[PDB]
Structure formats: C-alpha cells, structure tokens
Amino acid sequence: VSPPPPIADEPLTVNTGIYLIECYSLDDKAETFKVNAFLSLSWKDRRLAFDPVRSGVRVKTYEPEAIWIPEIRFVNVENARDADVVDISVSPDGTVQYLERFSARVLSPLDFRRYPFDSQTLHIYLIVRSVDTRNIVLAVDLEKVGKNDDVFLTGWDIESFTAVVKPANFALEDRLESKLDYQLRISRQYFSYIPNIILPMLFILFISWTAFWSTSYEANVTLVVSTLIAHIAANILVETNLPKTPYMTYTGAIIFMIYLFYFVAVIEVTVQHYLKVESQPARAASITRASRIAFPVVFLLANIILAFLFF
Amino acid sequence: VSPPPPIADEPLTVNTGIYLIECYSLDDKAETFKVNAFLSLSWKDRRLAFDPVRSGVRVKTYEPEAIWIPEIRFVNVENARDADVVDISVSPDGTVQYLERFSARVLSPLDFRRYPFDSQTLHIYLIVRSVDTRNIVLAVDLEKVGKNDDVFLTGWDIESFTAVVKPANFALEDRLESKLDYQLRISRQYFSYIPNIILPMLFILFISWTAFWSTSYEANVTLVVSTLIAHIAANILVETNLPKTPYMTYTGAIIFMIYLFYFVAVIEVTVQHYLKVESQPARAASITRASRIAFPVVFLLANIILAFLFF
Amino acid sequence: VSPPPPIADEPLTVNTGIYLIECYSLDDKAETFKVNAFLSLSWKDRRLAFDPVRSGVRVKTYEPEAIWIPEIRFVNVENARDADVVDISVSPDGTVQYLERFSARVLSPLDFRRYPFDSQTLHIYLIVRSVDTRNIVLAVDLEKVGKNDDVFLTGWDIESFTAVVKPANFALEDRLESKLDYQLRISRQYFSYIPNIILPMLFILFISWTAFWSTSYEANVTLVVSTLIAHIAANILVETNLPKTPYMTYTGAIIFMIYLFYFVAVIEVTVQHYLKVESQPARAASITRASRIAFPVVFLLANIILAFLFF
Amino acid sequence: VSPPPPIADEPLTVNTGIYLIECYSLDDKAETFKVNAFLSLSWKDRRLAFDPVRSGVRVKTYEPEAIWIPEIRFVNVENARDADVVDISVSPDGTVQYLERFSARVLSPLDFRRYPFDSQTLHIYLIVRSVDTRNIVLAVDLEKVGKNDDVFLTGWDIESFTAVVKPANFALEDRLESKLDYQLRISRQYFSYIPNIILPMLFILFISWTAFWSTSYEANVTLVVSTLIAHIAANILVETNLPKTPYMTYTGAIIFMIYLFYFVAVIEVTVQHYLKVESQPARAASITRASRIAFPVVFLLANIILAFLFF
Amino acid sequence: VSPPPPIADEPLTVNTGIYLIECYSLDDKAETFKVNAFLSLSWKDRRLAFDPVRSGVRVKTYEPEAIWIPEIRFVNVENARDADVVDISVSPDGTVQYLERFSARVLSPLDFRRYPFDSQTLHIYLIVRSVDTRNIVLAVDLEKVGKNDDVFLTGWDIESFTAVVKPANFALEDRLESKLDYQLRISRQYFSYIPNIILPMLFILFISWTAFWSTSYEANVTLVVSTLIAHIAANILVETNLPKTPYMTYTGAIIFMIYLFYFVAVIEVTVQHYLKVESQPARAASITRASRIAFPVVFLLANIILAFLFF
Ligand SMILES: [Cl-]
Ligand SMILES: [Cl-]
Ligand SMILES: [Cl-]
Ligand SMILES: [Cl-]
Ligand SMILES: [Cl-]
Ligand code: NA
Ligand code: NA
Ligand code: NA
Ligand code: NA
Ligand code: NA
Ligand code: NA
C-alpha cells in the first residue's frame, strides 16, 4: 500500500471516466447542482500481475483496503463526495479497473447575462496530487464518459457531457497536481417565462398607456401608480430567483427600463393636468396625442437595441 | 465472499420485494418523495448448505459481513439509501433470505399538464450489476411486494404499488446491469383548490365585470385595476407551488387567459370613456351592453375549449 | 447472541416503556414532530441467570455487544432513531433491564377539521419482528411510561402520554410482527388566533359594510374592493400554515364564506348605483336599508350554522 | 470497565464545568440556540492511582476506552451532543481530569411578554444517572465555568454565564438522577425595532388622522383604508418572527390596539359623511374637531396604560 | 503516540498553512461562510529521524494512526471540520509534513454600517492546547498560505487571504493555548443595488413630489399614500437580507429618512387642502411653490450629510 514503482522515471497515468446517473437541484442563486454518477479509474500496478494458467483465473477481484488506490478528488465540491466502491478488477498484466458510484454537490459559476434565454457549461474538475515516490497524471477514457438517457435537469435541456482530454498539470505546494475538466452543457427552457412573467408585465405596462386617451387626472394617477406597484411586485419576484451580479442582465435591463417608462408616464400625466388647470388644453392635447405614438415606438426601439446588445 | 458458483452457466437470480412502511414529503417543485420500506432479497448460495442434524438448527442466521450479499442499488435516489439489516436467514439447501429496512429520497419526474386534477406514477428503480465470475439478474417475488394500510401521502390518494416483473437487462460500461421498475400510482386530492384558489379567483374576475353596469370611468378604472392586482397575487401564489415546465399546464392556461379578460376589460372601459367624452354615448352604450353578454359567454366557451384540450 | 430459548413453546415477552424528555417541532404542514425520550426494554434470558448468594453481586452490567438484544423499531419514523444505550442490568433469574436514550422524527397524521380549536392524538408505534427460533411479543410496563414535567410543545397543551397495553399482533411477509401504540394527546392553544387573525379579519369585513351608509359609488367601490384585497392577504397567510386537506377546515369554511359576503356587497353597491343612475333612488334606498340589517344578521346566522356543523 | 468502588458508602462526585467558545442561531420561533463549548469533568478513581517516584511521571494520560468515564448527558438538547475528547489526565491519587469540546442545539423556552424589550435566561441542563454499584452526584467547579470574550449572539447582549451549584437530585425510572442548571443570561438589542417597525407604524397611523382635517369622504376612505392595509403588512411581518403564545405580548398588544384606532377612525369618517349628506354639517364639524384631540390623547393614554401593565 | 520530547525545555512549534480551494455561502443574516481548503501542518519529531544514505529513501510515508499528530482545531466553527488526510511525509531529520483537505462552516461577525458599500475581514482562527508533557505553539509558513485563482464568493470581490504571523498565546482552563488569525478580506459588489433597489426607491419618491404641481386633494392623497406603500415594500425587502444591528446601517438611515419625506409631504397635501377649503388659496399656493424647491433641496443636503457621516 505504496504507489506502483516506475519501470524507468515515468509518471503514473490514471485513466478516468464519469457516467452520469442523476442530475438534480440546479440552484441558480447558490450556483450549485447535485450529481449522482459512476467514477471509473484505471492504472497499471505491476506488483499485482499474475499468470492466468498458474492462477486458473483471467481476473482478480480485490477489496479497496487490500491494494493501492489513487487519492482522486473533486476540486469544485462543497464537501467530499459520498462514494461506494462497486468493483475492483485486476487483469494478468496488473491493469486495475476501479468503479465507484458517488453523489456530490458541485460549485459551478453561471453566466446570467442572457437570462432566461441562457446556456451554461457546468464543470466537474477531477484532481490527483503526486506522491514523493512518483508523479501521477490523469487521462480520459472516452469509452467510459457518458450519461443515462433518463438524466433530466428540471427547467433545462441537457446538450452534452464531454471531457477536455488534456489535463491541466501544475505545481501546488511544491507537488505536481493533475486536473481534468468534465463539462455538462445545458440550455434553459425559457417557455414558462413568457405566459407567467413577460406577457403579464407587458399587459400592465400597456394598461398604464390607456392614460394617454384620458383627460381625467384622478383616473390617470390611479392607472399609472397602480400598474407601477404591480411592476414592483414582478421586479421583486424575478430578483428572488437570481443572485446579485456585477453585470447587467437582459431581464434586469428590461425590468429597469420599464421603470423609466412609468416615470416618464407620470411626468406626462402631471404636465397634462397642470396645463388643463392653467387653461391651456390645446397644448396638453398635443403632448398627449404625441405620447400615444412616442411611448409604444420608443418602447419597441429600446427593446430592439437591448436584444441586439445582449444577443 | 465471492459470488455463488453456477451449477451450469446460468445467471444468478436475486428475488426482490419492496414493502412500503411510510411515504412522505412529495415535493412537486423538486419532483422527489421520501420512502421508508422493507427491501427483501433472496438467492441460492450452495456454499452455505448445511445438515440440520449436524448443526442442530433448521435455519442459520448470519451477519452481512460473514457471507456474500449482492450489491443491490437504487438508480433514481439522491443519496445512497439508509439501510439497517433486519435478518439474514439461510436454509439447508443454501437459500438465503435477506431483509433490510431502508429510507431513501427518490427522484421521479411529475407530469403537471392536468394540475391540480393530475395523477402520477412514481418509480423506484432497483439495480444490480454483473460481476466477472457471473451474471446477476433480478426477479420480483410478488408475495413480498406491498404496502402498510396506514401509508398516507398528504394531499394524495394512493392507488397501487406494483412491480414490472420483467427486468430491463442492458450493457453499461462493458458489464451487464439488471433493472427492476417498482411503481407507486397516486392521484391528487384537488378538493382544497376549489374554495382556496379557483372560486376566489372567479369572484374577483366577476367583480371586474360590474364595470359593464357603470358609466363612472374613475370607479371602473378602480374596479378593473384592483381586481387585476389580486389576480397577479394568485398567479404568484400558484407558480411558487409548481416547477417551471416546458409545456403549458391547465391551471397555467386558465391563469394566463384571465389576464386577457382583464386586458380586454381595460380596453372596453377606455373605449367607453373616450366615446362619452367625444359626445357619442349611444355607441359607448352599445359596446357596454354587448360586453355584459360577450365577457361571461366567451369566458365559458374558452374554459370548455381548455377543459377539452387538457382532459 | 441468538434469542433466549423457550422453556415450552411460549413467545418471548419484551416489556417496553417510553419516557418523554423533550417534545419539539410539531410541523402542521409536514404532519411530523420530533421526540427525545428514554426507551426501556425488559425480557427474561435464562442463559444469563446466576446465583445471588454465591456471586455476591445482585446485578450484572453487560455491554450491548456481549448479549442478545431484541431488534425493536419504530414504524412511523422518517429515519431510524438516534440511540445511545444508557444501561443494561441482569437480575439473578436472568431478567434483563435495558435502557436507551433516543431522538426521532415521527410521522403522525393530524385532523385539521376544527382548526384552530383542534385536539390531536400523536402516535409512536413500537414494533418487533419474530425470529425463526421464536416469536417475540411486546408488552407495556406502565411503571416505565411517562413524561418530564418541563415537556412543552410550543402552541400546544400536553394532556396525556399513555400506551394501548394490548399489542397488534399480525403476519407480515411470512413472520409474526408485534406492534404497540403510544399516544400523546395534545390540544391547540387557540388564544393568539383571536387578536392576530380572527378580529383583524372581522374589522375589515365590518369596514366594507359602511358602504351601506354611503350613496357615493366611487367611495363604495374603494371600500369593498380594498377590504377584499386585505381578506385575500389573510386567506394566503392562513393556507401557508396548513396542509391541503380533502375536507373543509372550520377556518377554511369561514374564510370562504367571507368571500361570498364581499361578492354580494359588490352586487349591492352595483345595484344601488345602477338604480340611482336610472333615476330610481327610492328603490336603491330600500335595498341599502335592508342590507344594513340583512348582512350582519345573515353573517351571524351562517356562523352559528358553521360552528354547529363543526363542533 | 465499571464505576470506581466506594471506600465507605459515599456517592461518586463528578465535578463539572462548561466554558463557552461560541453562541449562535438563537431561533425565537423554535426557542432553540446552538452552542460550542468545553465540557470539563473531574472525579476520583482509586484503581488508577500511582506512585510518582517509581513511575517517573507526575501525570498519566489515558484514551477514553482505557478507563471508566461517567455517562454525562444534556437534558434539553435536540440530539446528543457532538463531542471530541481533548484530554484525560490522571494525578497520583487517581484524580481524573477530563476535557471535551462539544457542539449542541439546546431547547430553552423564551418569555416574549416584553418583546422587543425582553431579557432571557437560557438553560443548559447537565445530567448523570446512578448505577447499581453506586450513586453518582454532580458538582460545579466554578474555576472551570466561563466564556470566551469574543462570544457574541447576533441581536443580543450576553450578561452572564453561571451555574446553580446545588444539583437537583431525584428518582427517574427507579434510579437516582443528578441534574445541574447552567444559566446564560441575555438581553435583546431592541435598537433596530425603532427605525424599522415602531416609527414606520406610527407614521402611517398619524397619516390616517389627517382625515380629521378633511371633509372629502372619498379622500378620507382612501387615507384610512390604505394605511390600514400597510398596518396589516406590519402585523404579518412581526408575527412571522415570533411563536404563537398563550399570553399577550407587548408588541402584540400595541399592534392589536392600533386596529381599534383604524376601526374607530372609519366609524368617524362614515358618521361625518352621513351627517354632511343629511344636511347636518354643524354636528359633523363638532365630532371631527373633537376627534382631532380625542384620537392622539386616547392613543397616548392607552400606550401609558399598556407600558405600565407590561413593565 | 505521545508528543515529541523536548531536547531542552522549548515549546513544540507547529507550522501551519491554509490554502483556499472553495469559498461559498456567505450568509449575511447568519454571519457565516463555508470554506473548502488545504490545512498543512509541520513539526519536528526526532523519534522519526532516519539515515538517508543507508535507507536509500529521502522520505517515509506514514498513516495518521502510526504517528503522533497535534490536535489542531478551529475556534469559530459551527461543528468540527470534515477532514481527509492527503499525505504525511517524514524527512531524514524527523520533520513531519502533514496535509489534509477540509470543509467547515465558519462564524465570523460582519460590519453592516456601510452596506451595500461595505468591506469585510472574515476570520479563520486556528488553535492548539498544550499537553502536560509539553507546550505547543503555532507558527505560519507563508509558503503554504494562499488561494486558488478560481475562488469566487458570489456578490463579493476577494481582496486577500493572509495570516497574522504572531500567535495569541494565553491560558485557558489551566493550560496554554496558541491561536492564529487567518484573514480573508472581501468587498461587496454594490452594482446590482443601483438598478434593483436604489433607483426604483428614488423614482417612487420623486413621483410623490408631483403632488406639489396638483391642487386635486383626492389625486394628491392617492399619489403620496400609494408610493408610501411601495416604499414600505422596499423597506421590508431590504431588512429581510440583513440581520438586526445595534447600530444604524447606511441604507437603514436613508430608508428611515425617506419616511420623514413621505410624512412631511402628507402634512403639506393636508395643509394645502385645508387652506383652499377655508378660501385662502393664495397661502396654499405659497406653501406648495416653496415645497417644489424645499423637498428636493433638503433631500439632497440630508443625503450629503448622511454620506459624510458614514464614509
Ligand atoms: Cl471528492
Ligand atoms: Cl441505494
Ligand atoms: Cl427506529
Ligand atoms: Cl448529550
Ligand atoms: Cl475543528
Ligand atoms: Na488504498
Ligand atoms: Na458481502
Ligand atoms: Na446484541
Ligand atoms: Na469508558
Ligand atoms: Na495520531
Ligand atoms: Na382612489
């Protein structure tokens, strides 16, 4: 229970694979997701080599404690993975085949710039630290990388699960570490956002614009202030499903812009009333008639500009 | 502590059974449920054969570490099950009878299309992977599949708990896997939705239609905008109890449609005021009188169409 | 470490007791409660008998691993109990006295029909499964059933903690099972519901009835619609503290009924305005004056009927 | 291992001490708090005595499994404490000095009568049960009772951490039990309640009283009903931070009383409008002018009475 | 497995290092954060010294149970850290190099005075208690203190991770204790607060000031009372993201001040209506015209004063 000795001076290659069984709990605010998968490991340990003829077997099954196993860890996990060894098999030439089933909570940053029309690349970083005896390097066995067809992540479409085959080798506390990047590509199912948030938010805004066909200040004040309050409710609802970002987001940009439209509508309603009281309704009529065209036109142009800047 | 040897070349059959003791925490948003049950396992291990005359006893009792036990796992769990072995009984021929009590979280997708008048089939998948010495296959002992009479899932009716007797045998990462599908059929108790959400939502909508018997624009604006805000509160309440779906739901369809009715009622109230101010009340009167019939009639027809498309 | 052998063919009687130390976290929505208690067990093991005059020792203290202990479990628990053995004492005749302190999360259905004036019977079901060597039956030692005087369940009065002395003996998966029912009787402290929910809800309803002393349609619309919105807020608040039931609760019935009163008040306010506009105020005056008496009278009678149907 | 034998017939005295390292998560609704502390224990075990000269050591260190250690438990904990033994030192006469660091979630009832100007005495109850061989009694070593200077409980001032030196000795399940009461005295930091809840609540109430300087019924209805809704929001906010109590609380009393003031203000606004419509404004003017003085005066007197009854 | 003996009388120096791998869950209300890191320890044990010439090995690898390891703990953790030993290496002179990967929930108070433009110094306190055989003192190996480049704390900028090299040596329960202070300096990303909370809050306040260009009391009452309610919603939203502090926060001060502006605006709207009704509109006009300048000017000056007092 020391590492396999090198024949010359070569690093020990540990072949890896991850096969996804379950994907769940993608938490946008926490920027975490839970995973249940198979982790497969393979390496050459000559001390375990045997003759098939003499032994009368083509495979040898060991218990984890009986042999040397590389200390493989995940970089971006909350706590160490919950793992259960499934099988350890040794071929006559000492080729070890290790299989474990694990569950882990993974930290992986999300880009919310295009929310809710966003795509993400979730990462699972595999790592191994070298020992004083020898250097350990990781490799990808593409034959053992995959996912169950039933793997579903509520509210998302799973595109692919692949591995960057070339490890990132680097020094950490005067020892070599070898890191692999497993990538889960997902795209958000934006469907439900349209009848639940986007269209209700547009309906209340268009309702505030009916004030441009009314001379009644008291009815106008009621129309614009009431719909503004409903917009505040939606702003609060949206920001509870999202983390605080150093950058602007598409939904955040639209929500912010709609406040400007409420603010300018209040100015218009105030200006209209003021002129009416001052016995200059001809003026007030010109501003109100212009507003009927200006507000939807500027709203459409501003949305085209925003969609262009974000997509 | 290697698998039982084959007399010829056949696979080792592991007979299974699940007996439900408790069902709790059906989380609609998470699409999970918690289960507390008996897991029974049975297989022949002739290496454990004994003479009752020599050993004195008619049945031998073993500790899990003393004998070979098949590595049975659940596919769709969050974490590995919490299990406590209740008994391991070995009969003279070598037939093992294994009993454990376990608790587990189960991932099982839910179809919300007909919510809150929906039924679900929850799944518990049992799996075993084959070893090199021999192939292991799962079977259902129907005599050991069941549920306690007191098993209750708050807000649901439990219909049945059965197993698909034919396992799904397939290759996974160059070894055989034998999978069993245990199905828990449940139907939602829709009762409470009627006095708590459906009737309050209808009352506020009918209250907005009183604007069709009023010429007072300022009272009308108050009626339609205030009831709209109450509808937004209900929309938010409903969407918090449900996950985001790539498809429309019945409740979601009705909630969305009721916005259209509020939006068209605002148009009517605006059109009515505009004509009144323009000294054309005869027109306004014709539109308002038509609206008194059109709004409830189109609401009833649209609901018949929706109920038909969903049920 | 096999069960004690029978002198004739009799079942092994395991005397039980539960002494409550702490009661906490009664979750109405989850229908669970947490418990911290002593579990006492007593049975005869003749293999462990000793001479009192020869040994000098009146009692012998064993470690759990040194002797046979019955596998006692709880039926209605989320997960297996967290237990710590306190003492194991053997008397000369071989009578074993076992004591453990445990904590567990218990599933126990609640009847919300009379909420918040409801009483509940929480259950803790003890169970033992018979072995092939012999049948194990449970009994209650009333001397070892009780609760600490300081045991408090926030928002509830603890009435009694008793056990149904006769076990439920039945066959489960071809073996005998012996089940005991420990009952914790509690009654809800309804006090706080009166100044926090009931009286505020009545105040807003009575405020809507001031519309029956007003001819101002615009003020009336404001009175009835605003108070209705406040009632919706209370409806939502109440239903968050309760699970969804396939029956009406007492509070649910009152909350539902108050909607009818708001709906009929809107009809009255509409009818009054319509007649006034139609130059028939004498009529409107008769309906409004009748409403001043009818609304409080029908509200009182409907509440007497509801209280009678529920209590 | 067995308890230390008595020289005569005396009970074994176990000297105790608790040194607080961290205090966190005081949950008002749950009436729990989390603690991280040192637990020190000391007792004489003659069997472990040694001569310093022939040993060459003035102190002897032991592993917990090597010697007898009293089974000390906490009464008012959710689950058994998470403990790690730090040191076990034996002096020549066999005086054992035990030290462990533990973490526990403690149940301790809170008196909310004077909230948010309340003080609490949190308890940590230490207990030991007697064995058949001998009686075990607890004592306090005041030299080993204390707290780290950095111990902070968010939202509270920590006054003292002391122990009631005389244990409560009593019989439980036919064995004697020795209980110690460790008391943590804390006082609530009421500061934030003034600008966040108290003053905003007073501002909206005073805003409703502007209706006593207005003859406009429509504006008055808007003033009193809108501010009432804001008061309902604060009532809901406050009751979410508190458990349901069988007794009234100070904040609860004020919140309830403010509803009466809203209810009576609506009566006044109604009475004023009714008289105005009946062509008796002289009367209405007398009631409104009286209300301008009566409402603030009765509000001040009622608050003096409440503060007196509660403090 | 006793501590290394001193050559003279010197304390044992344990060199420490923490290398951050993950930072997550900075909870403002709980004043906690979770950390995943490497903990490195180094000390001399002469009993483990060997000859490198005759051994042919430069380093010897040990299992934690095979050698003496100092009991290092964290002061400000909720529960004991979850640790996994990575490596133990011994140099020929007997210098031990210990490496573990751990995860822990850390308690560290936060200063909210300047929120959301605040910076924090999070602490991780390392501690060791001296043994009876010898005094243990901690030191910092700056070569083994650091953080992964990918370390991200959502909503924060990570400035530095350093250690105070001089330990705090002190007596605690009649033994020496050696404490090290590891400091993680972070600054809040205030960006999102501007379009989500600050600007919406300013827009509603400016909307209330349009009442200074209106003579309509009923419209004015609607403007000031409706926006006040929206301000209450924001006050509640902000105080849910923050703990209760015995001091004013910057945001808390602004939120409180904005209430005064609403309260004085209601006084103005009331005074204006009263004078008009009293047939003194010339006066009312002078107060309203002054208010148009006074309200924005006093708001700007008060904000300059507040920003100055807090920054
Ligand atoms: Cl890991
Ligand atoms: Cl499993
Ligand atoms: Cl159990
Ligand atoms: Cl304990
Ligand atoms: Cl620690
Ligand atoms: Na190994
Ligand atoms: Na086995
Ligand atoms: Na045993
Ligand atoms: Na011991
Ligand atoms: Na050690
Ligand atoms: Na109004």
The domain boundary, picked from C159, C192, C225, lies at: C192
C164 in the same domain as C197: no
Half-sphere exposure in the Cβ direction for A228 (13 Å, CA) = 29
* Distance in Å from the first CA to the final CA of chain D: 56
Peptide bond into C116 cis (omega under 30): yes
DSSP B183: E
DSSP SS3 for B84: strand
Closest-CA residue of E relative to A230 is E230
E30 strand-pairing partners: none
Give A1: exposed, middle or buried? Use CB within 10 Å, 0-12, 13-18, 19+.
exposed
Which residues, 6+ apart, have CB-to-CB distance to E43 below 8 Å?
E4, E12, E13, E14, E15, E70, E95, E96
Distance CA E153, CA E23 (A): 6
Distance CA D288, CA B182 (A): 74
Structure tokens at A216: 């009644």
Residue type, A298: V
C262 in the same domain as C127: no
Distance CA A14, CA A136 (A): 7
State the ligand closest to the CA atom of E103. Answer: 5
D48 in the same domain as D187: yes
Using alpha carbons only, how large is chain D's radius of gyration in Å?
31
CA distances from A216 to A213, B121, C220, C239, E216 (A): 9, 57, 19, 40, 11
Residue A232 is nearest to which of E59, E144, E200, comparing CB atoms? E200
CA distances from B117 to A104, B193, B200 (A): 36, 10, 18
Structure tokens at B251: 């409740």
* Distance in Å from the first CA to the final CA of chain A: 55
Which residues, 6+ apart, have CB-to-CB distance to C143 below 8 Å?
C17, D174
Distance CA D128, CA D74 (A): 9
User: Chain C contacts of B21, Cβ < 8 Å?
Assistant: 75
Most A-contacting residue of B77, B173, B215 (CB-CB within 10 A), to test interface: B173
Secondary structure of chain A as H, E, C letters = CCCCCCCCCCCEEEEEEEEEEEEEEEECCCCEEEEEEEEEEEEECHHHCCCHHHHCCCCEECCHHHCCCCCEEECCECCCCEEEEEEEEECCCCEEEEEEEEEEEEECCCCCCCCCCCEEEEEEEEEEECCCCCCEEEEECHHHCEECCCCCECCEEEEEEEEEEEEEEEECCCCEEEEEEEEEEEEECCCCHHHHHHHHHHHHHHHHHHHHHCCCHHHHHHHHHHHHHHHHHHHHHHHHCCCCCCCCCHHHHHHHHHHHHHHHHHHHHHHHHHHHHCCCHHHHHHHHHHHHHHHHHHHHHHHHHHHHHHC
Q: Quickly tell me which residue has 């050993």 as its tokens.
A: B55
Chain Cα centroid distance, residue D220: 43
DSSP C192: T
CB of A187 less than 8 A from some CB of B = no
CB contact under 8 A, A107 and E24: yes
C201 in the same domain as C188: no
Residue A71 is nearest to which of E86, E144, E233, comparing CB atoms? E86
Structure tokens at A234: 């939606």
Q: Are B22 and B38 in contact (CB under 8 A)?
A: no
Structure tokens at E127: 């501690």
Which residues, 6+ apart, have CB-to-CB distance to D240 below 8 Å?
none
CB of D119 less than 8 A from some CB of E = no
DSSP SS3 for E164: strand
Longest dimension (CA), chain C: 112
Q: Quickly tell me which residue has 């390292």 as its tokens.
A: D21
Q: Are B207 and A207 in contact (CB under 8 A)?
A: no
A197 in the same domain as A187: no
Query: Among B273, B274, B268, which Cα is nearest to B288's?
Result: B268
Query: Among E133, E159, E130, E28, which Cα is nearest to E70's?
Result: E130
The domain boundary, picked from D163, D192, D221, lies at: D192
Residue E243 is nearest to which of D154, D207, D219, comparing CB atoms? D154
CB of D262 less than 8 A from some CB of C = yes
Distance CA B124, CA B39 (A): 12
Stated as kind and residue range, the H or E segment containing C171 is strand C156-171
Distance CA C166, CA C169 (A): 9
Q: Are C93 and C49 in contact (CB under 8 A)?
A: yes
Secondary structure of B203-253 as H, E, C letters = HHHHHHHHHHHCCCHHHHHHHHHHHHHHHHHHHHHHHHCCCCCCCCCHHHH
* Distance in Å from the first CA to the final CA of chain C: 55
Backbone breaks in chain C (C–N > 2.5 Å) follow which residues?
none
DSSP SS3 for B35: strand
B173-178, long-range: CB within 8 Å, 24+ apart, which pairs?
Answer: B173/A17, B173/A19, B173/A38, B173/A40, B173/A99, B173/A144, B174/A143, B175/B129, B175/B130, B175/B131, B176/B129, B176/B130, B176/B135, B176/B136, B177/B127, B177/B128, B177/B129, B177/B130, B178/B127, B178/B128, B178/B130, B178/B136, B178/B137, B178/B138
CA distances from C180 to C34, C176, C185, D247 (A): 19, 14, 16, 37
Query: Among A183, A187, A182, which Cα is nearest to A120's?
Result: A187
The number of domains in chain A is 2
E215 in the same domain as E168: no
Residue type, A61: T
Q: Are E130 and E169 in contact (CB under 8 A)?
A: no
* CA of E52 vs chain D CAs: smallest distance (Å): 34
Q: In what order do the strands lie in the sheet with C72-74?
A: C72-74, C119-129, C176-188, C156-171
User: Chain B contacts of A193, Cβ < 8 Å?
Assistant: 244
C266 in the same domain as C188: no
- In total, chain E counts a number of residues equal to 311
* CA of E166 vs chain D CAs: smallest distance (Å): 19
Query: Among C214, B158, D306, which Cα is nearest to C222's?
Result: C214
* Distance in Å from the first CA to the final CA of chain B: 55
CA distances from C189 to C123, E211, E310 (A): 20, 49, 47
Q: Are C14 and C139 in contact (CB under 8 A)?
A: yes
Distance CA E68, CA E70 (A): 7
Residue A242's φ and ψ, nearest 5 degrees, are -130, 150
Experimental method: X-ray
User: Chain D contacts of C90, Cβ < 8 Å?
Assistant: none
Distance CA A110, CA A249 (A): 12
Q: Are C157 and C178 in contact (CB under 8 A)?
A: no
| Resolution, expressed in angstroms to one decimal | 2.8
Residue A246 is nearest to which of E61, E103, E191, comparing CB atoms? E191
A275 in the same domain as A218: yes
CB contact under 8 A, D274 and C17: no
D243 in the same domain as D142: no
State the ligand closest to the CA atom of D79. Answer: 4
CB contact under 8 A, A131 and E61: yes
Residue type, D24: Y
Q: In what order do the strands lie in the sheet with B119-129?
A: B73-74, B119-129, B176-188, B156-171
Which residues, 6+ apart, have CB-to-CB distance to D63 below 8 Å?
D88
Peptide bond into A116 cis (omega under 30): yes
For the four alpha carbons of C244, C246, C248 and C249, in that order, the dihedral sign comes to negative
Q: Quickly tell me which residue has 């099954």 as its tokens.
A: A61
Query: What stretches of chain B adopt beta strand conformation (E)?
Result: 12-27, 32-44, 60-61, 73-74, 82-90, 95-107, 119-129, 136-140, 146-147, 156-171, 176-188
DSSP SS3 for D284: helix
| Centre of ligand 3 from the C-alpha of residue C75, in Å | 7
A77 strand-pairing partners: A106
Distance CA E135, CA E178 (A): 9
DSSP E5: P
Give C55: exposed, middle or buried? Use CB within 10 Å, 0-12, 13-18, 19+.
exposed
Residue by residue, DSSP assigns C39-68 as EEEEEE-GGG---HHHH--S-EE--GGGS-
Distance CA E106, CA D175 (A): 41
State the ligand closest to the CA atom of C70. Answer: 8
Residue by residue, DSSP assigns D18-76 as EEEEEEEEEETTTTEEEEEEEEEEEEE-GGG---HHHH--SSEE--GGGS----EEESS
B245 in the same domain as B162: no
CB of C54 less than 8 A from some CB of B = no
Distance CA E90, CA E73 (A): 22
Using alpha carbons only, how large is chain E's radius of gyration in Å?
31
Please report the residues numbered 265 through 284 in chain C whose beta carbons come closer than 8 angstroms to any beta carbon of chain D: none
E119-129 and E176-188 beta bridge pairing: antiparallel
| Centre of ligand 1 from the C-alpha of residue E128, in Å | 28
Q: Where do runs of H (alpha helix) occur along chain C?
A: 52-55, 193, 199-208, 217-240, 250-277, 281-310
Which residues, 6+ apart, have CB-to-CB distance to C235 below 8 Å?
B196, B200, C255
C204 in the same domain as C76: no
B82-90 and B136-140 beta bridge pairing: unpaired
* CA of D224 vs chain E CAs: smallest distance (Å): 10
Which residues, 6+ apart, have CB-to-CB distance to E272 below 8 Å?
E215, E217, E220, E284, E287, E288
Query: Among C161, C25, C152, C4, which Cα is nearest to C67's?
Result: C4
User: Chain C contacts of B57, Cβ < 8 Å?
Assistant: 133
A182 in the same domain as A241: no
Closest-CA residue of C relative to D71 is C86
DSSP E47: G
Distance CA D145, CA B175 (A): 62
| Domain containing residue B301: CATH number | 1.20.58.390
User: Chain B contacts of A230, Cβ < 8 Å?
Assistant: 228-229, 232
Query: Among E301, E306, E298, which Cα is nearest to E264's?
Result: E298
CA distances from B167 to B60, B140, B182, E139 (A): 30, 9, 10, 61
| Centre of ligand 8 from the C-alpha of residue E184, in Å | 50
Half-sphere exposure in the Cβ direction for D146 (13 Å, CA) = 10
* CA of E125 vs chain A CAs: smallest distance (Å): 20
| Domain containing residue B171: CATH number | 2.70.170.10
CB of A30 less than 8 A from some CB of E = yes
Structure tokens at B285: 């009167």
Degrees to nearest 5, angle at CA D195 with D192 and D200: 135
Query: Among C38, C8, C9, which Cα is nearest to C22's?
Result: C38
- In total, chain B counts a number of residues equal to 311
Domain holding D228, by residue range, is 193-311
| Centre of ligand 3 from the C-alpha of residue C73, in Å | 4
Q: Are D33 and E106 in contact (CB under 8 A)?
A: no
Residue B154's φ and ψ, nearest 5 degrees, are -45, 125
Q: Are E126 and E143 in contact (CB under 8 A)?
A: no
* CA of E244 vs chain D CAs: smallest distance (Å): 6
Structure tokens at E197: 């909370």
Degrees to nearest 5, angle at CA A296 with A293 and A302: 125
Query: Among D39, D10, D9, D180, which Cα is nearest to D99's?
Result: D39
Angle, in degrees to the nearest 10, between helices E250-277 and E199-208: 10
Q: Are E262 and D203 in contact (CB under 8 A)?
A: yes
Using CA atoms in the order C208, C212, C214, C217, what is the torsion angle rounded to 10 degrees? Answer: 70
The domain boundary, picked from B174, B192, B210, lies at: B192
Residue type, C79: N
